[PDB]
Design a binder for this molecule. Structure first.
Ligand code: NA
Ligand code: NA
Lengths: 316, 316
């Protein structure tokens, strides 16, 4: 055994081709074993890759649709933080056993998210092994248009999209035995947290607009403090966070205690939100942008002389 | 846990940067979290992806250097069969435990092969999980220059590079208890087979020249019959193989019986040779090419009216 199945053999090939037929930058005919891709000549390519392993990056009971969604969402969130326009991706699936129905359901979730951001699956592998999903996503950026982590400026405001800590809250409730991840619950606050863990929303549209407003950006996937820490270190500045200002969802505040909710918001994994810095005179414009996107953008802190990320004045 | 480590955090980042510094199509500075890639404007990109899983695609005792070599070799062999020029790749490593020395040795093998074909590692992931290595390789082709599986012509000769069945022979000897894969042996024929399994040679240089000579091509990784089968099916022709003509190495003939060696050559996994078809009047030129490349090219059969791959006249 150990055969590698590339394109044409993919269980998803019909849905793959349906999407390449409507893309003038992808040549993939019925009788084609690999796609020919046409980059934009004056743009640059950026490439991200992430592997999600069963039991590590998702609880084993996570359903196929949610695995398909989240595997792509991680990569799209990476591309968002660079302000890159998603173009193409590959998918390398390791499965212990053939399961036609599982792959179809995985494809449901993958394409549900992929279609929203016009990223086209154009190749990959299906082979035997412990359940592991590796996605490589390719995006494009105009010259000098990429967002970076090293360009925060003294006096900048710090901003973050969406809400922080929901996924960590769902994970904690699941570990305490209070939340089933494999089925939908009618209890609205639990279901909200469940879907923030299972189906994070990559802020691609925001990322594509931030170049016009922001100085530096990072995606928040290892917790706000860790990821803002990359901005502070790469930019050679201090970052100050006002913990009271953090955007905390209704459900997180309702279902977790004050301290646990705060810890989730500051240090929780897997938010897949965007944290960025902007000149103070962008405040009006960023509030307008949040309304335009129907996406919360919350001013949470400031960039200042010194080093390290601070919470309420303390960097220790 | 479950953190994803991308570029800048890679244990291999110093060797990565040493190689991007000498590539004018890759922008990756010391203070850069992701590379910007510049495609050739008039060329098309093709992308391949393969995952190798411990115990599945390589015996668990395979050493780190050989895992690094073979993981890339699979992808380069895919690119070779398309006549694509390798450009860039990503590497997504799942490791059960941090091991600095293992990753360094893996990098030795990866870069040993990558440097020979001027393919640059430009990103990827390192994360926790059962040992699994997923590589995405990006190559480029001029307009209409890609080799294809569907263009064999009636009357073509069938050709194959190198030798067939060595890797399968080593695997059989290992399964019978006669070959240790984790250490070098001084016994020359065993060592030859061992390295054909552990370190296959992707025929990239051949692939880049075949467009000038060949009609159709495929890489042989699931055995000659399976892979030539793709040419026959996609081209709507019969392929006839003369089994007596197959290139069988000294070591394979010496260490396996006549029947086992024949079965390895016809159906053995993991040769990573190239099988192609060419007009009969290319015979002189292809012998000259083999001399030029110091690479055996062996005429093994013919394309004819009918369907399916035949051995000594039989397609059953
Ligand atoms: Na198309
Ligand atoms: Na360079």
């Amino acid at each position: 055994h150990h055969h590698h199945m590339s394109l044409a053999e993919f269980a998803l090939i019909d849905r793959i081709r349906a999407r390449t037929l409507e893309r003038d930058d992808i040549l993939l005919g019925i009788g084609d074993d690999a796609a020919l891709l046409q980059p934009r000549a004056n743009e640059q390519l950026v490439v991200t890759a992430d592997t999600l392993n069963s039991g590590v990056h998702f609880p084993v009971e996570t359903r196929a649709f949610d695995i398909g969604w989240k595997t792509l969402a991680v990569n799209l969130s990476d591309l968002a933080a660079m302000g890159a326009r998603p173009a193409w991706c590959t998918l390398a699936l390791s499965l212990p056993e053939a399961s036609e129905d599982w792959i179809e359901a995985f494809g449901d979730g993958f394409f549900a998210l992929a279609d929203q951001h016009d990223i086209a699956l154009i190749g990959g592998d299906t082979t035997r092994g412990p359940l592991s999903l590796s996605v490589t996503a390719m995006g494009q950026v105009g010259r000098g248009q990429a967002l970076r982590r090293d360009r925060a400026q003294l006096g900048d405001d710090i901003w973050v999209s969406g809400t922080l800590g929901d996924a960590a809250g769902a994970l904690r409730l699941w570990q305490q035995g209070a939340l089933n991840l494999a089925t939908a619950t009618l209890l609205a606050d639990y279901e909200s947290l469940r879907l923030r863990l299972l189906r994070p929303t990559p802020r691609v549209t925001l990322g594509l607009r931030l170049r016009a407003f922001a100085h530096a950006a990072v995606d928040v996937s290892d917790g706000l403090l860790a990821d803002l820490g990359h901005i502070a270190a790469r930019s050679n500045v201090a970052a100050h966070v006002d913990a009271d200002s953090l955007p905390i969802s209704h459900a997180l505040r309702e279902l977790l205690g004050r301290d646990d909710a705060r810890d989730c918001a500051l240090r929780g994994g897997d938010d897949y939100e965007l944290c960025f810095t902007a000149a103070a005179d962008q405040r009006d414009a960023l509030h307008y942008l949040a309304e335009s996107l129907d996406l919360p953008l919350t001013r949470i802190g400031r960039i200042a002389d010194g080093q390290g990320v601070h919470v309420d004045g303390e960097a220790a």
